[PDB]
Amino acid sequence: ADYSVLYNSASFSTFKCYGVSPTKLNDLCFTNVYADSFVIRGDEVRQIAP
Amino acid sequence: PFERDISTEIYQAGSTPCNGVEGFNCYFPLQSYGFQPTNGVGYQPYRVV
DSSP: OOTTHHHHSOOOOSOOOOSSOSSSOTTSOOSOOOOOOOOOOGGGTTTOOO | OOOOOOOOOOOOOSSSOOSSOOOTTOOOSOOOOOOOSSSOGGGSOOOOO
16 A cells, blocks of 8 residues: 555645654554544534534 | 753644644643642652752
């Protein structure tokens, strides 16, 4: 899997991510990676916070 | 070693630079000790020489 495309051309502002950074992931070796998508309230798209 | 520094500037937590906003993830380097009566014996001040 080539994960360089995530940061090859991106403009993600306000990138406040906690934990392991998805970029520079080839160094770490794992087995399964999952992507989750969901539908929530329309007015709470910017209202979701940790 | 054996050097005393008094520099106090905005600390860089990570990306999205503060730019002098002093907001989230942007705190002063100097912090005061927590000295409250509701603390254990290990939190009391000690005369360390």
